[PDB]
Amino acid sequence: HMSFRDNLKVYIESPESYKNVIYYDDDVVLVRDMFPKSKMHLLLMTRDPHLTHVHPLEIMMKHRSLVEKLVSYVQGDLSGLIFDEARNCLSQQLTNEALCNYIKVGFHAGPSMNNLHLHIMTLDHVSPSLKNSAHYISFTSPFFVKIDTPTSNLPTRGTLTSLFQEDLKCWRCGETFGRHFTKLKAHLQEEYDDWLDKSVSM
Ligand SMILES: [Zn+2]
């Protein structure tokens, strides 16, 4: 397991060693992504050696126990922690109320790291580390498998390549930008400021 794709393995082996880790116990580790693709971008990782290397699509289909445990952490145990993190990344003026509708949770259909990781992130996609269409698309299309996706609605592996070829479009308003990733980025910034302006008075 010496591929760079195995680099997450350190967080579940020795979570006590990394400042990036904001919660762990015997079962899971909540860690900040080192290349955040939104203002807040966290990963929830199982520490189970027999689950960490299972593909997320096989997890969704055949490991509901784990799915339910992860959800219980996100929506229960760690909810307050995640909202506080969001306030640190966005604005302290934001309520859990407003943040709840500004966060998404799910797996990549074709992860790039080998250890199972659930993405927990704000919707903005305003971040320096979002650098190409593939990044953006991987979070705003069916390639992002929302944790509440029914098994019957899981994406087909074969058809996954075609998503990354399509014009860029804003997730919030649907405006398209062709392949002008740079124009998309400027617009995402505009969308975030708008959401933030509306939301801080609430
Ligand atoms: Zn828009």
Identify the residue whose tokens are 């400021």.
Answer: 193
The active-site residue, picked from 41, 63, 108, 117, is 117
Measured CA to CA, the distance from residue 83 to residue 94 in angstroms comes to: 9
Residue type for position 73: Y
Measured CA to CA, the distance from residue 48 to residue 93 in angstroms comes to: 37
Measured CA to CA, the distance from residue 119 to residue 37 in angstroms comes to: 10
Q: Give the Å distance between the CA of 162 and the centre of ligand 1.
A: 23
Q: Give the Å distance between the CA of 189 and the centre of ligand 1.
A: 9
As given in the structure block, the two tokens for residue 32 are 């900040």
Q: How far is CA 134 from CA 85, 112, 131, 187, in A?
A: 26, 12, 8, 17
The number of beta carbons lying within 10 Å of the beta carbon of residue 149 is 16
119 catalytic residue (yes or no): no
| Residues annotated within a binding site for Zn(2+) | 170, 173, 187, 191
Query: What CATH number does domain 1-202 carry, 3.30.565.10, 3.40.50.1820, 3.30.428.10, 1.10.260.30?
Result: 3.30.428.10
The number of beta carbons lying within 10 Å of the beta carbon of residue 152 is 6
Closest Cα partner for 58 from 159, 161, 145? 145
Identify the residue whose tokens are 């990963």.
Answer: 43
- The experimental method behind these coordinates is X-ray
Q: Give the Å distance between the CA of 30 and the centre of ligand 1.
A: 30
Resolution of this structure in Å: 1.8
Identify the residue whose tokens are 């909540």.
Answer: 30
